[PDB]
Design a protein around this nucleic acid. Structure first.
Ligand SMILES: NC(=O)c1ccc[n+]([C@@H]2O[C@H](COP(=O)([O-])OP(=O)(O)OC[C@H]3O[C@@H](n4cnc5c(N)ncnc54)[C@H](O)[C@@H]3O)[C@@H](O)[C@H]2O)c1
Ligand SMILES: [K+]
Ligand SMILES: [Mg+2]
Ligand SMILES: [Mg+2]
Ligand SMILES: [Mg+2]
Ligand SMILES: [Mg+2]
Ligand SMILES: [Mg+2]
Ligand SMILES: [Mg+2]
Ligand SMILES: [Mg+2]
Ligand SMILES: [Mg+2]
Lengths: 45, 161, 86, 46, 108, 155
RNA sequence: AAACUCCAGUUGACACAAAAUAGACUACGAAAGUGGCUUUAACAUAUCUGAACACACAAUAGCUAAGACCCAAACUGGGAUUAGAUACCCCACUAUGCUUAGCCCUAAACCUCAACAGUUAAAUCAACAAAACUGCUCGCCAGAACACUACGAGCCACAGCUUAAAACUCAAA
């Protein structure tokens, strides 16, 4: 059960990381992400 | 480059009449028939003659830097073959740090000798980083994205103006 | 195995005294440390226990020799009282 | 002094020219490295 | 540096021993060595039975070769001594005369 | 029933738990097992140096593996003999050496089991799949179920 | 009792295992560690201090790939045993102990004494331990338990490691 909780937490961490990254380029004025940018999954092997 | 194996030992290079001896004696008194430490001594002597103003003064900071650089080269040569020698890896890393400290002192005190040492030994002096912190995955990815976002912002501003 | 036989740990019998030869061989093996080695090799002694045992034995020997030296040094005074009464 | 000692010593070294003669001479020779010590510290050669 | 080769050769007749000694010294010279001397310690019973090249030996001829060689030669020479079928056992050591006889003042 | 605390925990251990072992699978593929409460050793008149757990077993209407008991026992024992290793290292010990490498691969492919799964990370459905495939292999090989690798190592 | 009797004794051949005696020595290495023989490389720094995180190492156990397997041996079987036997004894045999290339990063990892420099005069000095102190620097600590925990963060680690709280409670510990 701790595996399910832990993997859900890792998913939420990845979502938070993506949200912050999006916040940055949205505030900078870019409507979309940098050309060719793709957020890597750093919290999953 | 190493000294040629035919070169005489440091202790048998000024003996009078050393050039009037048999070829066998020359071989016996050459680097070919000795261990690596005599070759390192010859390297140190060559560097001292090429670099320092007074080659006899082994007490100066430049002489110490030359000696430690020769030792560092020896450790690197050892570790090229002995890749799992942790003790010698530690010795190499400590020696590099000590040479950096001596180079910093030399730069602060005598800039001309510092330049001469850096040129002669092929050393590229580098300034230390200001902050020591882990570059974990999140920070690396975030910094990459920030650099990129700055680049498209610059492109967009150039297009605007 | 590769050595010559009947040289190591070999004793000759004198005038048919087999018991004396056997006891001499036992003494030789004891003072050469072979008996204690054989008896200690029957079961494995852990390195920490081995080190503790050797340290204890060495310090026991040193302490015993010092005590014996002290007793022997103080033995000289143990004689008849020269000032009996006073 | 060391250089001169080596210079005089090399005259007796084994070379490709004198290999066979020296080999035979060694075969017809014996050298003994054994000696014993006494309780008094005196060397007793064989 | 200065090295000493302790050679235990098979108990052979004089011509074969001479040939083996010549071959060994020639290998030393081919590896860059300068041979100083060759001492024959004699033929004697081995301290123990030695098995070499699918042959058992109880006797052997003991020889000493003093020489000067580059440090890289030693390893190579060892390999050669492993292949010579007439060598029971060859060992290269640093020459004991090079080792310095440090003097002491006695028991403290 | 009362057990020692560790035995009760192992009987009622979930996947991934430090106490997941043979007893966990064997009890939980047939019963609903609940470790209700633990009694400390001080409460027993001659006080033991261990705690005591109370475990309730309720037999399941539908057992989670429809295979003979001894087959499941052998499979679970061979899976858990190397508890910290990959599961395939234990599974290969079910087959003779000659067909060890090939049979383990066939078993893992037919059962659809990730070889890198450790014994403590195997659910009862993974054991169901492995037991079914092992039953098929035993039916197709009459001498397989009686193989003991230790006896083969005796020779 | 089981087991073996392709068993046992002498003799000969014969390791990828482990290194009597020396060692009653107290050495080398930053620590961990290091005690069969030979050889080659080789043991940083001529101020000192200087990091949970930077850079390099860390016994034993444990995990990936390959290999070796004498002996030992968690587990797994069998023999023998009270009256719920011996967990313990006997036999057989695994992981593992070994080598190669990578992980993991923990110890009563302890001299339970932080590094450098200095003193032996003072009242020596709570106690015990290991005589009592001084200068200077870094690290750390401010009642117990909650807690070598939860959450957050980092990690080739995935119920693992490092950092590390709060609430409720008590007059103690
Ligand atoms: N944080 C730095 O990068 C940094 C840089 C220069 C000097 N220092 C000095 O190191 C001392 C420790 O500072 P802190 O308490 O804030 O660090 P800290 O211990 O609280 O750790 C926070 C960060 O500082 C780094 N750090 C820790 N000790 C350091 C050191 N001696 N040198 C360089 N980096 C270090 C760590 O890697 C970590 O990333 C201070 O005296 C500070 O002046 C720190
Ligand atoms: K201790
Ligand atoms: Mg420092
Ligand atoms: Mg800090
Ligand atoms: Mg480790
Ligand atoms: Mg291991
Ligand atoms: Mg094994
Ligand atoms: Mg410190
Ligand atoms: Mg508190
Ligand atoms: Mg924790």
């Amino acid at each position: 059960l701790r595996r399910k909780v832990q993997e859900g937490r890792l998913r939420r961490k990845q979502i938070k990381f993506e949200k912050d990254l999006r916040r940055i380029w949205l505030k900078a004025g870019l409507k979309e992400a940098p050309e060719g940018w793709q957020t890597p999954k750093i919290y999953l092997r | 480059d190493d000294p040629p194996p035919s070169t005489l030992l440091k202790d048998y290079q000024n003996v009078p009449g050393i050039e009037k001896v048999d070829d066998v004696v020359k071989r016996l008194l050459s680097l070919e028939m000795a261990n690596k430490k005599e070759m390192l001594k010859i390297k140190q002597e060559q560097f001292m003659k090429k670099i320092v103003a007074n080659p006899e003064d082994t007490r100066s900071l430049e002489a110490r830097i030359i000696a430690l650089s020769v030792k560092i080269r020896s450790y690197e040569e050892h570790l090229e073959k002995h890749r799992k020698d942790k003790a010698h890896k530690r010795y190499l890393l400590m020696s590099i740090d000590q040479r950096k400290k001596m180079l910093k002192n030399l730069r602060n005190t005598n800039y001309d000798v510092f330049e001469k040492i850096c040129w002669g030994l092929g050393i590229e002096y580098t300034f230390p980083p200001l902050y020591y912190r882990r570059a974990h995955r999140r920070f690396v990815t975030k910094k990459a994205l920030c650099i990129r976002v700055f680049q498209e912002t610059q492109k967009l501003k150039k297009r605007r103006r | 195995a590769k050595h010559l036989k009947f040289i190591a740990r070999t004793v000759m019998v004198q005038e048919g005294n087999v018991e004396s030869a056997y006891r001499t061989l036992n003494r030789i093996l004891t003072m050469d440390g072979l008996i204690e080695d054989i008896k200690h090799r029957r079961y494995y002694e852990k390195p920490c226990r081995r080190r503790q045992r050797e340290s204890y034995e060495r310090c026991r020997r040193i302490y015993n020799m010092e005590m014996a030296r002290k007793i022997n040094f103080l033995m000289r005074k143990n004689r008849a009282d020269p000032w009996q009464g006073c | 002094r060391e250089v001169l000692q080596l210079q005089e010593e090399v005259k007796n070294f084994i070379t490709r020219e004198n290999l066979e003669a020296r080999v035979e001479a060694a075969l017809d020779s014996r050298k003994n490295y054994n000696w014993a010590i006494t309780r008094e510290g005196l060397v007793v050669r064989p | 540096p200065r090295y000493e080769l302790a050679l235990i050769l098979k108990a052979m007749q004089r011509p074969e021993t001479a040939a083996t000694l010549k071959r060994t010294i020639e290998a030393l010279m081919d590896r860059g060595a300068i041979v100083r001397d060759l001492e024959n310690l004699g033929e004697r019973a081995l301290p123990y039975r030695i098995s070499a090249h699918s042959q058992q030996h109880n006797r052997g001829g003991y020889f000493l070769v003093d020489f000067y060689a580059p440090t890289a030669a030693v390893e190579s020479m060892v390999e050669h001594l492993s292949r010579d079928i007439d060598v029971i056992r060859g060992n290269i050591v640093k020459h004991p005369l090079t080792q310095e006889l440090k003097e002491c003042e006695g028991i403290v | 029933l009362t057990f020692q605390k560790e035995v009760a925990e192992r009987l009622a251990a979930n996947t991934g738990s430090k106490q997941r072992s043979r007893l966990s699978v064997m009890a939980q593929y047939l019963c609903n097992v609940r470790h209700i409460f633990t009694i400390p050793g001080q409460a027993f008149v001659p006080k033991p140096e261990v705690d005591v757990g109370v475990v309730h077993f309720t037999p399941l209407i539908q057992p989670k593996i429809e295979q003979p008991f001894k087959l499941v026992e052998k499979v679970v024992q061979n899976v858990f003999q190397f508890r910290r290793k990959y599961c395939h290292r234990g599974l290969r010990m079910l087959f003779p050496e000659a067909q060890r490498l090939e049979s383990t691969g066939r078993l893992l492919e037919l059962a659809d089991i990730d070889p890198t799964l450790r014994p403590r990370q195997l659910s009862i459905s993974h054991f169901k799949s492995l037991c079914d495939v092992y039953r098929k292999m035993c039916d197709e090989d009459p001498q397989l179920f009686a193989y003991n690798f230790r006896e083969e190592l005796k020779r």
